[PDB]
Each structure stands twice: as C-alpha cells, then as structure tokens.
Amino acid sequence: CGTENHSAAYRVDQGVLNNGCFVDALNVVPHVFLLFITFPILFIGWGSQSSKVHIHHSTWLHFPGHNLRWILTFILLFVLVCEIAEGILSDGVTESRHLHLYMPAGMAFMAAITSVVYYHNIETSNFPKLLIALLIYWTLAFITKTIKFVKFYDHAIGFSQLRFCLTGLLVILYGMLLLVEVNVIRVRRYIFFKTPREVKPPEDLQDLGVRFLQPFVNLLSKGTYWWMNAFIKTAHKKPIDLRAIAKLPIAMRALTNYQRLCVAFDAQARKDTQSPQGARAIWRALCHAFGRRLILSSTFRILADLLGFAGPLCIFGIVDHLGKENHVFQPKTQFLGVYFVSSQEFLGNAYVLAVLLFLALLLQRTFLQASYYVAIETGINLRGAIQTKIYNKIMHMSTSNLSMGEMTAGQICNLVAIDTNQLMWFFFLCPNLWTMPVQIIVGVILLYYILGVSALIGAAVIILLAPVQYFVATKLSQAQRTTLEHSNERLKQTNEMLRGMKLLKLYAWESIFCSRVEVTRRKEMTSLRAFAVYTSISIFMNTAIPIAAVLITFVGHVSFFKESDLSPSVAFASLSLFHILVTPLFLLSSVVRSTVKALVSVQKLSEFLSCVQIIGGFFTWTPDGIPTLSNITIRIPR
Amino acid sequence: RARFVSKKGNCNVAHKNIREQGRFLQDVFTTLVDLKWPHTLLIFTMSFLCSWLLFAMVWWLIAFAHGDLAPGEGTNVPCVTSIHSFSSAFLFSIEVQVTIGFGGRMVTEECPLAILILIVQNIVGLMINAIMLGCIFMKTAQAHRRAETLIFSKHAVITPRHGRLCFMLRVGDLRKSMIISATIHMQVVRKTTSPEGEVVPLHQVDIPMENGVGGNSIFLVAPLIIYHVIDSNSPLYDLAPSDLHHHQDLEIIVILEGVVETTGITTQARTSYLADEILWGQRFVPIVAEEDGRYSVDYSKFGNTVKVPTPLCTARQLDEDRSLL
Amino acid sequence: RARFVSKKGNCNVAHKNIREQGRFLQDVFTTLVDLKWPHTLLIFTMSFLCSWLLFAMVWWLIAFAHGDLAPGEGTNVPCVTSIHSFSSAFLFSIEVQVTIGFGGRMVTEECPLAILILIVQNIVGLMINAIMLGCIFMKTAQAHRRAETLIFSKHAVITPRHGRLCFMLRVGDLRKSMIISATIHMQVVRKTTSPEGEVVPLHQVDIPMENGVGGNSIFLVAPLIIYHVIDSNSPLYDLAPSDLHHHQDLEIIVILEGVVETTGITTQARTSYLADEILWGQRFVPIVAEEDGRYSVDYSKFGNTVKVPTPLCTARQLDEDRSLL
Amino acid sequence: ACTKYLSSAGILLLSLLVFSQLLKHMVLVAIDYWLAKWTDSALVLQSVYAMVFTLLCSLGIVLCLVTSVTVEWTGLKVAKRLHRSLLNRIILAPMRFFETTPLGSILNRFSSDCNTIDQHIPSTLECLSRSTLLCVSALTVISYVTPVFLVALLPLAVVCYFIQKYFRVASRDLQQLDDTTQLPLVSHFAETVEGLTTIRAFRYEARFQQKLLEYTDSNNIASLFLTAANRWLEVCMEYIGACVVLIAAATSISNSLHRELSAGLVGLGLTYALMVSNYLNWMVRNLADMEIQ
Ligand SMILES: Nc1ncnc2c1ncn2[C@@H]1O[C@H](COP(=O)(O)OP(=O)(O)OP(=O)(O)O)[C@@H](O)[C@H]1O
Ligand SMILES: Nc1ncnc2c1ncn2[C@@H]1O[C@H](COP(=O)(O)OP(=O)(O)OP(=O)(O)O)[C@@H](O)[C@H]1O
DSSP states (O other): OOSSSHHHHHHHSHHHHHHSSHHHHHHHHHHHHHHHTHHHHHHHHHHTTTSSOSTTSOOOOOOTTHHHHHHHHHHHHHHHHHHHHHHHHHHHTSSOOOTTSSHHHHHHHHHHHHHHHHHHHHTTSOOTHHHHHHHHHHHHHHHHHHHHHHHHHHTOOSSSOHHHHHHHHHHHHHHHHHHHHTOTTOOOSSSOOSOSOSSSSSOHHHHHHHTOSSOOOSSSOSSSSSTTHHHHHHHHSHHHHHHHTTSHHHHSOOTTHHHHHHHHHHHHHHHOOSSOOOHHHHHHHHHHHHTHHHHHHHHHHHHHHHHHHHTHHHHHHHIIIIIIOSSOOOOOOSOTTSOOSTTOSOHHHHHHHHHHHHHHHHHHHHHHHHHHHHHHHHHHHHHHHHHHHHHHHHHHHOOOHHHHHTTHHHHHHHHHHHHHHHHHTTSTTHHHHHHHHHHHHHHHHHHHHHOSHHHHHHHHHHHHHHHHHHHHHHHHHHHHHHHHHHHHHHHHHHHHHHHHHHSOSHHHHHHHHHHHHHHHHHHHHHHHHHHHHHHHHHHHHHHHHHHHHHHHHHHHHHHHHHSSOOOSHHHHHHHHHHHHHHHHHHHHHHHHHHHHHHHHHHHHHHHHTOOOOOOSEEEOSOTTSOOSEEEEOOOOOO | OOOSSOSSSOOOOEEEOOOOSHHHHHOHHHHHHHSOHHHHHHHHHHHHHHHHHHHHHHHHHHHHHHOTTTTOOSSSOOSBTTOOSHHHHHHHHHHHHHTOOOSSSOBOSSOTTHHHHHHHHHHHHHHHHHHHHHHHHHHHTOOHHHHHTEEEOSSEEEEEETTEEEEEEEEEEOSSSOEESOBEEEEEEEOOBOTTSOBOSSEEEEOOOOOSSOOSBOOOSSOEEEEEEOOTTOGGGGOOTTTHHHHOOOEEEEEEEEEESSSSOEEEEEEEEETTTEEESEEEOOOEEEOSSSEEEOTTSTTOEEEOOOOOSOHHHHHHHHSOO | OOOSSOSSSOOOOOOOOOOOSHHHHHOHHHHHHHSOHHHHHHHHHHHHHHHHHHHHHHHHHHHHHHOTTTTOOSSSOOSBTTOOSHHHHHHHHHHHHHTOOOSSSOBOSSOTTHHHHHHHHHHHHHHHHHHHHHHHHHHHTOOHHHHHTEEEOSSEEEEEETTEEEEEEEEEEOSSSOEESOBEEEEEEEOOBOTTSOBOSSEEEEOOOOOSSOOSBOOOSSOEEEEEEOOTTOGGGGOOTTTHHHHOOOEEEEEEEEEESSSSOEEEEEEEEETTTEEESEEEOOOEEEOSSSEEEETTSTTOEEEOOOOOSOHHHHHHHHSOO | OOTTGGGTTOSHHHHHHHHHHHHHHHHHHHHHHHHHHHHHHHHTOOOSHHHHHHHTTSHHHHHHHHTTTTTTSHHHHHHHHHHHHHHHHTTSSOHHHHHTSOHHHHHHHHHHHHHHHHHHHHHHHHHHHHHHHHHHHHHHHHHHHSOSTTOOHHHHHHHHHHHHHHHHHHHHHHHHHHHHTSHHHHHHHHHHHHTHHHHHHOSOTHHHHHHHHHHHHHHHHHHHHHHHHHHHHHHHHHHHHHHHHHHHHHHHHHHHHTTTOOSSOTTHHHHHHHHHHHHHHHHHHHHHHHHHO
16 A cells, blocks of 8 residues: 555554545455355365265255345445456556555455355355354444545545445445345344244255255256256266166156146136136236246346347447557546546456456346246246146036037147147247347447448348248248148158058059159149248348348448448447347247237137936937937936 | 165265254364365365464554554654564464564554454464364374274175074184274165065164174184074075075175274274175185194185085975974 | 153253262363353463463562662663563563563573572463363364264154064164164153052163164164064053053153264263154155165155054053954 | 268259358358458548448358358259158068068158158258358457467367267257157047047046146156256357457457557457357257257
8 A cells, every 4th residue: 555655644644544545454354354264164065065975965945035145246246346447447547556455345356255155055054153254244344334435525526436436336235235134034142042933944845856856946046057067967977868868757856846736726816807708818817827927037038138238339448448549548637546437438447348248248148048948937837737727628618519529629639739839939939029129229229329321221121121031931831831731742642652561562562653753743842842932931031131231231331421430330339239130130020920820829729718317308419409319218227 | 786885885875855954064073073184184274374364464454553664753662563564464473373483573562452462363373273183183093994904705605504504704804903892783684575564675684693602792813704593583594595696686784893902982894795795505715724833814715615515495494304304 | 741851852850959069069171071162262261361460460570579670770680671561571471371482571590589480380381271272172072963963753653563563763864974883772761650559750661672683773874763562561561542642641762872983982862752742553654765876765754654554452452362363 | 970961962062052152151251351451441541442342242142142052952852862762762672571660660750851851951951051150250250360379269169069068968868858758748638639528437537637737747847958958058158158258358458458459350359259159059059950950
C-alpha cells in the first residue's frame, strides 16, 4: 500500500486515519480465517471419501434457502469479478503498484469458493457448526462494508465512483446473507436443545434412490454434471458398457415413476372445472395442469434471449478501444487515488468483459438447454398423463360400439399414438416460439442501431425466407404423403414378395421379379421424382442460407453506398446478428406448422374425448334406433 | 461368481440409506488414524501453515494500527522491533509458535494489546503441536501389518480321520514374534430357507473346533491343521464329494483373531473358501522335518496336497453304512 | 411408564447415601478425561496462566528486592536486564516457561537467589507441559463415538422357527471399519418374587444366544438377527401373545460389547425393549440383496416388519400341543 | 468403418461432386477472408470497391447449387442401385436358404433400410459434410488468425476427443435403447384395441392399467435419457467451446497489444469463436446422426 510516505501519513491521523489502507486490510483477515479453518474439514472429507467411505452410493439433504444461496454465490462472483476489474485499473495508473488496493477482492473469490464447499460438506453431513462459522464470517464482512461506506461518505463522490458501485453490490449480499443464517432447523443455540425438525432427515427422494440403480434426481447441483458422470463412468468402463448398453431399462431405476403418477393425477384435477368438456376447456385445463413449468421454462427461455442477444455488443468495444483507439494512451483523468465509475468500457475491461460474455454465453446455452430440458420433461409427463387418461378413458367408457364395430377404433389408436407424440412434439419448442419474436425484434432493433439498409436487407431476406420455408416444406410434406402412398405400394409388393417366397421358384422368380421389379420401379419412380422434389426443397434450404449471405453482401454494399462512412463494426458484429436470425427463421416456420399440427392434434384429442334373473330385457346394436332384441326372458340356475 | 470376501481379506459391502453423515464428521480421530501416510502429512503440514498465516496477519496489523513502521520516528518506540516488511511479521509469527527465539525482532511494553495477543498465539500453537503428537502415535501402533504375516493355504481338504469325516484347514506364521490368546472362529455362510417360508440371504452358522476340552485357541509357531468333524449338527452332513463342489455356490469364512506380543492391540485376519476352492480326497503334505538343531518347516509344500483313497459317499450315508455294519 | 434405560443408551440411576467424596476428588485423571472439550480447554488455559502469574510476581520481586530498576545506576548491574516495568517481568516469565528466548531480557551472575529460582520455574513449567500431553492424548482415544455407528432396530419380533418359538433382534453397522471379538449379552430385567416371600426389585436373568457351539459372538459386517429359543428355562415360556404386551411391564436389555480395529479400547452399546416395543406375528424384512459387484444392504427396511400367520398360544401350550400330538 | 459406404451409389461422381462442394466452401471462406481484408481496407480509411463488392458475390449461387449438387439426384442412383441391386441380389438367391430364414428381419431391415436410408440419408449426410467442413474451415481459419503460440489445439481435441469418444459410446447406447423402446407400446395398444370385450371379460381391468403405466413409464425414463444426451452434449460442447472463446480472447489480447494489431480480423476469431462452438455443437450432433444413419 506504500509508495513513498503513505504508511507514515496513515499512522499520524487518529482512528486508523479514517481507514486509508486499514479498511482494506480489515476485510482480509476474515477471509483468511474462513479459509484456514476450512482446509482441515475440507481436506479430511476429501481423503476419507477416497480410501474408505460408505457414503459413495446414496446421500442427499436439503436446507431452507438453497436457491437463494446459489443466487448469492453467483452474484458474489459477479461482484468479485467487478471489484478486481476496478482494481486492475487502479494498479495500472503506472506510478506505483499499491498491493493493498486489490487484495480484498482476491481473498473473497477464494473465500466464496470455500463457502460453496462448506455448503456441499454441510449438504452431505447435517450440522449447524458450519453455519455458525459462516455466520461469523458474514458478520465480520458486514462490519468491513460499513468502514468503506463510512470512509466514503466523508470522501464522497456520488455516482462517479466505481469502488462504491462494487461496495454497494457487495453490501446487498450481506443483507441477503442473513436469512440463510436465520435457519430454524439449526440447533446450535442454547434454546430448543432438541432437534427442531425431525422430519427433515428422512427424504422422499433418497428412498426413491436407495432402491434405485440410477437415482436421476432433480434435487442436485443443477449443472448437468452428475447426470452425466453416472452414465459416463459406466460408458467409460469397457466391461461395464456392454452390460449397461443392453440392460439399460433394468439399469434404469424408474425413479421419476413416483412423479409420473402425480402428473396423471394432476391432469384430472385440472379437468375438474365448473364447465363441460371442450377442446378449449381441455386446452386451457392442460395449460393450467402443467402449472409452473410452462411460464417458468418460458421465463428461463426469455433469460436465454437476454444473455444470448447481446452477445455481439461486447465485441464492438474491442474494435473501438483497440482498433479505433489507435493513439489514445491516456488511462484516467479523474481522481487517480481511487476508482471512478466512468470509462468502464476500457481495453482490459473489454477483455475480461469478453470473458464475461463467455460466462454469460454459458449462462445462455445453459439456461437454454435447461428450459429445453424442462420442456422435454413437460412433454414426457404430457404424453404419459394424457396417455393415462386416454387409455383409461377408452378402457372405462365402452360407448358407441357401432364405430367400434368397424376398424376405425384401431385408426383412432394409431392416430392417437402418432397424433399424441405429434402433440408432444408440437409442444416440444413452444417457449422457443414464445421467445423467437422477442429475439427477432431486439436483434432487429440493435441492427437498427447499426444502420437501416442492412436491416432492410437481412430482415427482407428472412421475410422472404420464411414462406419458402414452410410453403416449400409443405410441398415436401405433400411429397411425403404421395411418396408415402407409393412407398405403401412398395410395402404391399414387399409382402407380396413374401408371398413370392411362399410361392414356387421359377414362377415367382420370373413373374415376381419382373412384376415386383417393374411395379416397384414404378412406385419407386414416382417416389423417386417426389424424392427429387423433396431434395429440391432441401436444396431450396441450402440456397436459403446464401440468401442471408447475399443480404450480408447487399447489406454492406448498399448500406455502404447510401451513407458516407466506413467502419469494421457491422461486418463482424452484424454478421453475428445474421447468425442469430437463422435459428429463429426456420424454427419460426417450423413452430408455425407445429402450431397447425398442434391445433389439429388437440382437435383430434377433443374428437376422441366424446342364480340368474332376467326380466323383460331389450338389446340393441345401436341406441339411436329400436332395440334389435325385445322382451328376452330366460333364467339359468347355477 | 458372486463373492462375499476376498482370498486376502477386507470384504467390501455396499450400504444404502444413510441417516446422518454428521456423526461421522464429529468422530474425527478414528478417520484421521485410518487415513494413509501421504494425506496424513498433508493435514498436519497445511493446518500448521494455515495457522502460521493467521498469527502473521494480525501481527502485521498491530504494526499497521500503531503505524510506527514506515515513518521511522526516533522518539516513537515500536511494539516490536525490526518490522520493516510484511514478510517480517510472518517470520516473527513462526518464531513464537516454534519457540525459535531468533532475537532480531524484540517486543516492548508500549502496546498492551499485542502482548495479550502473543499469549493467545502461544497457547493455541502449543496446543496443536501437542494434539499432533497423539495423532501420529496412534498410527504408529496400528497392527494390521502384523496380521498379514499370518498366511492361509490355497485350498482346503476333506478326508476321514479315525473313522470320521473331517474338514481340514492349515495356517502358518512367517515371524519370530508370536500372537497371544488368539481365538479362531469359523462360520458357514449359506442362504438357508426355513420350513415356514422365510428366505434369509446369508445365514451364519458356527462349526466346532473339535478340541476335546472345548477349545478356543492353539499355540501357533509352526503350521497346524484345524479339523471339522461332520456330525448330525454339521450342515455338510448331507453333501456328496463330486456333487457338492459345483452344485452348491456357498462359502465358508475363516476368522483368526489375536494380540501382538509387542503391542496391546488385537488384530484379525480373514479369508474365504468357495465350493471350487475345496478339495476332496487329498491331504496336507507334512511341512515339519526334524534336523540336528531344530525342526524346520518348508513353505513350498504348504500349497501342496496329495491324493489318498477315500469314500465317495456322504456323511449321512457313511454313518448309515457303519450303523448297518 | 417407568424406565430403566433409554432407547439410545446411558441409563441414569439415582444414588443415595454417599460415604466420601474425597476418593473421587483424589482420583483426578478419570474425571479429567471424562469432561467435555470446552471445559477441558479452560482447565489447561487457566492453569497455565495461573502459573505464569506466579513466576512473574516473584520475578518482579527479585528486582524490587535488589532495587536496581528505578535508580538507573551505571555501576550497579541488574540481575536481569531491560526490566523497566511491572509487565516486563511477566513477559520474561512467559519466555522461560515456553522457551521463547527473545533475547531482550538478559540474566547475570549478580544475584545467586534468582538463578536457583529460575531453575524451579523451568522444571515445574516443563512438568505441567508434559502432564498436559498425556491428558489430551487420553481423550483422543475415547471410543464411545465408534460405538454409536452400532444401530439397533425400532421394535422386536417373536415367531416360531423350525417348530420352536423364538425372539428376534437385529443389529447393524454403518462403518467400513469393524469390531473384533465383540460378545453380546442379553438380560431380562423383571421384578421376581421367590416362594419364601422375598421381593427383589430388578432381577437379572440371562437368556441363551442359541449358537450351536456355545456362542459368545458373531462376525458383524451386515445386519444379522439374534434368536431366543423359548424352552423350559426361558421366563417367556408362560406368556401369551396379546396378553403379555400390556399386562406385563418389564424390559429386556441388549448388551453389545467389543473392540475397535483401530484402537485397543473396548466399547459398549446398550438399549432396552419394553412390553409395547415387542411385536408378535411379524418378522424382519430381508435387507441383503445380491448385485453384480457385491451384496447391498438397505437400511430403510431395517425398521420394517411384515406379518405372517402364527399361533396365538403360549410356549407351554405350544409344547403341550405338540407333546399330545 | 466407411469403406462399405464409399461404394454406395457410385464413388467417382460422388467424390467429384462432394469435392466440388468442398472447393465451393473453400470459395465461401475465401469470400469470408476477402470481406475481412476489404473490411481492413475500410478500416484503413472506394479503391477496389467494384472489385470487392462485385467479386465477393461470385460463389453464392455457385455454393448454393454446387454444395447441394452431390445429393441433388443422388437419391435416384441410390434408389435404383440400392433397391434394384438389393432386390436382384436377394432375388437371384435360391429360395431354400431364404425359405429357412425369419422373414421379419429380412423384410424389416430390407424395407426399413430402403425407406429410412433412402429418405433420411442425404439430409444428415450433406449436413454432416457441411458441418464438418465449416468446423475445420473456420477452425483453421481462426487458428491462422491466431499466432502459432495461440493455436493450443491439443487441449481442444483432447477434451473434444474425450467428448466424441465417450459420447459416441453412450450416445450409441442411448439412441439404441431409446430407439428400441417404442414398438411394444404400440403392440399392446393394438392388443388394447383388439381385446376390448376381453377387457370386459377381465374383471380386473387395472392389470393392463398398471402394466400400461409401467410401459409408458419406461418410455418416459428413456425420454429422460434422451434429454440427458442432449443435456451433456449441448452443455459439454458449448462449455468447451466457450473455453475456446476465452482462448480466442487471449489470442486477440496478445495479437492486439503484444505487437502491431491488424486493421481487420480481430473480431473474426470472436465471431468464429461463438460460431466455432456452434460448429462443435452441430458437428457433435451431426456426428451422432451420422453414427445412427
Ligand atoms: N454412605 C455410603 N456410601 C457409599 N459407600 C458406603 C457408605 N457407607 C459405607 N460405605 C461402604 O460400603 C460398604 C458397605 O458395608 P456397610 O454399609 O455395612 O459398612 P459398615 O459395616 O457400616 O462399615 P463402614 O463404617 O466402613 O461403612 C462399607 O464397607 C463401606 O466401605
Ligand atoms: N437411513 C438410515 N441409515 C442408517 N441408520 C438409520 C437410518 N434411518 C434410521 N436409522 C437408525 O437405525 C434405527 C433403525 O430403526 P428404524 O429404521 O425403524 O428407525 P425409525 O423407527 O424410523 O426411527 P428413526 O426416525 O430414529 O430412524 C433407527 O433407530 C435410527 O436411529
């Protein structure tokens, strides 16, 4: 902290000189204490689980404020990156390197990372002794925040200070941190010397898992790290893999089996309304049935649109502070003794903020595949629940046996399967459709902050690329209908060739080789030209990506010619915007035909939603008409 | 194919449905004693260093709180002399903990805060140095290693002695040091079904040592054979020679206990012999050979067995044949 | 409602009419070892400080008796240098006891009294530092904690096996570490009256382990059931199923003993099952399940029992019904 | 294990057509580097503006037609060659050894191989060639944009080698079991439609209800395996590709300040870093579709 005479200056003034370098040194001791206590407990649990441990099979426990503990562990990461970022600028000033200026931020990252290992060691073994050592830290860290604020008020800037912004963010964590420490299930106090919660130790999930070969429990780190290391270890083993890849159903423990049932039961509850059954009624009951995960996974998809959309903005800053700033060479103009909030888009902050764009890109792909995951689980519970009430409904009803007298009920079974999985596949990316126009509008808006004519070029390119996509794909779908009919004729000649194997040698060889090869070349010729139309639409799709390429060239060319300026911005950045557009274009038209198939599938679902004494008994083939049998009377003794 | 315990020992079992891991965490000493040497050294080296840094930060703080280190005022006397750098405080902290007493850094009577702190530094650093002495000693007394020198044969044998069918197992010692009051317990672990319809997965039934007195143990200097007389209470009474080795998939465990003549600790050596690990018809070759000075025992013959003419009938049939005779 | 021992252990008893407390006071080590960690640290911290002050007062006295500290005479050499304040003597005293050897306070050859005192300070302060090492070690070896991992079931069962009525209790282990030569003793504590008119409040009569050999203990890795065959010597021979659970207010204690494979110390785990804690008609569900690698044991089934068809008669009546048959 | 597939529907014309598609994509990355170098020319401030913006649109329609030319009419020669050569290669066989064989595997593998391979082979094939061509194309392009010290390709293909190996194994197993799980459900659906009066005869209709729930339960668990596959696929591939983006940021750092930074191609490693992770994503899943297909 000393360059020439700073230590002496600090020493002269009373009260640690209003904490010049002392406010920073004060923060460090608690972090060291929190890290020096930890190694003994962390290391031991690292060794006892490596040589001889029995808790290597099934162990899990929950604590009140789990989601607020992770959210505070993630937000303290963003605040630790930020403190250091500001810290780097102060160090550079290029006069003297003050070591005690950026140290409090580097201690914290290790400490907060050590706090996450304490939560994992506590989630394994339930004891309040750890929450008391953390509380001892949260309180000492709370008191150090006050000094910085206290020091700062006298030395007030307002909003022009970057040290303050970091401190302010940090202060909220301490406030948030108290609730975690206020758990009622902790028996470390003198009061309530017994266990306040006796039903907490036994978990429903563990019991699911204890008899489970593969637990597959959602109540985990939520990082998709253990869901892959359990399957993965077996896959890595060579002897294990052969066994695993064969008896996988047996290997599967059918864990979510206790949760599939709830969804079937939940569907019935949703249906239970005051109004009669309706296509709309079953639709909005189904949306009411899913409950949290629809708008929840949609909200995670919108957060993925938030992190994903910006992606390019960080990149421009590099071309400006690096490329355009050719001979700037001026680090600061404010009070150089401290950090200031202005010019936060520095050159180094463009680097670490670009790595922050990589970390937020992991947040965007992670939350993207997370909402994808909850969508797939939602469709799994969807087809399971609607399958349950479906076959329970037709198994219980036994109504209108006249249409059941025909084979149309079997068509209702096959179309119930293809339309049911077509309906879950219709629901498969519904938050992606909900979050597609927000990404198109926001990306088109940032494209409008770039220029106008490029937005006209690319937006017109997608605006023409969508009707060729779903219309040409609809032509390929009719090609799949007629080609499916001719391929069904190939199946009829194929089982007719099985009849040729049932027939003689010479007669079936000549007449079935000639007739089956000629008719199979006929229907395979019509489906060959249909295959040429379908591959032509696939080439239409192939051509479509150069439509975007053409727009990029016409965008930079015409948008260059209408204006009177040149920049390396819109090439790299606006090319990036174009990449974003492709996923939402064909996914948008695919979501449109998915919506048409969704309304058709819900329409077909609503269409499906419709010893002995005998005295004077009347029987019918059809209740709409007069009984077929009248006044039938007989009794049979046992 | 399914096994219970290895031919060397330490049978591994899988546990499901644990209630609390907190009790295990609370019970620190046993785990510490159990852990291997590389980690053990790591625990004591880091915990010491982790402490040395804590006593150094608060010492760099008492000089920063007084502030006498950078201005260099001649009238203002420092609470500790020669503290010029940040590192020096850490060096001083090491000094007090290990009682090196270098002499360069001297403590004065100016600050009544650091002197009470110095006492807290010394008592806790004297306490962990003492706690470490008792933990390392406990590992210096582990007697698993003594138990290894206790060797068991490759296979087992079953031949009739004195007119009665017996099961033979041989054990030996490779040391000049002995084991006191070492009792041996053999159990037959098979899955039995009761007449009421209950299936116990692994039932453990004990078999007699056949000592006339009512034996528990025997003085072991040279390789001795243990014999299991098949009577009406023995489960192997209804077993045939060529039919029992493949048809049945059971195991018999050997439990050798005892204490060391050097250390009070009592150790245990275990092994198991399968249906294919047992031989019928042969016997254990005589290891003891008498020389001019003493009796010598060759261990290459320990895993050698010779076949002799024995009956191909079961013990129920053998006692039945002798009760009819 | 009246209990003898808890479902966890450590049965509390009230003692009246004590003869002397002096013997207990005299026996210091056991009490010290027994006391919890917070007080234990307090005893060693205060006793050290209490000593450090005694060695400091007599050192502030040898400088006060010589008087060389305040006049500052250059020809008169002090028995110990740099003694300016009262606190300094205490600091010097700490130095000698912990052998810090700072170097600021030096001792001379002027006063033949303080040098012999310095020897008395060092030998007693070296003695309590050594005595503390042996007391802390003794607490590092307490094996009550190892005994906790030894779990007993929630309730007990009584069903006939092989045609004879038996009482079943199951015990398990949560560790990878074992217990050697661990003998189990079960006692029935009921208040019996003799034919002469004497009422003993709590009579302890032992029940057989039913091991064929004459068993004391069994190798415990997985949860095993202990069985109590009701014969003519068993007190439960004259008991009916629905009448014995409420009419009688007695208890049966479980005494599990044994030694640790890590430490020589032998521990004991105890529990008791009341008249309402015993179940008639059901049995213990099979915990052991065979997998590809090893045999797994689920502990959620440990406290689960299933009911099967059993006779509603007493053992005297059951043997009477079979002796008439 | 593609030497059998290399002889399918010809070798020479497919090798020249897909070779011309690879050359057309090399012309596409030539349009990329020409737009990047002319972007450096605009950053140095037209001079060659007619040459730049006119010459930079040559391989657009050429890449669109030539890149889709290898599978343009390949379904015709694969249709008559595979269908006629297969139906003739099984038609000229004697009827005794074909008569002593189960017809379900022959007609199932035969007809499902013809419709499935003839319908779905060229889409994932051309998507696989486009994905791998773009992946190695921008991979070596942004790799040369980095200095030789800033390549660091050995950890990338190390962790990527781990991912493609063990995800190839477990993904083949997961698509195998989840692919095989579907048919018995529809089998007892046909049995459910057939024995409806037997369900009236079976006085305990809940037996097929709970067994039914076990079947759809097993397919639901298999669906959770599918989401596990896409989960670790997307998260692992985008995670390691994000590490490649951070290494790209290190390359832009050293190439930016450590020496004379170029007038362009600074953000080319960044856009090609995010799209490099996209290339690892569609390259991994395209490797999966090429594995099953
Ligand atoms: N109040 C007490 N509490 C515990 N132990 C006692 C008490 N009083 C005596 N004892 C001890 O218990 C033993 C029981 O015998 P008894 O109570 O008859 O003692 P005693 O014959 O009175 O002889 P003494 O005077 O030594 O107790 C005695 O030998 C004595 O040592
Ligand atoms: N998951 C577990 N793993 C190991 N031990 C357990 C577990 N659950 C309970 N125990 C202990 O084992 C004993 C077995 O009895 P049981 O399993 O019936 O417990 P319980 O009747 O549910 O009472 P508790 O709620 O205390 O477990 C219990 O007394 C308990 O202390």
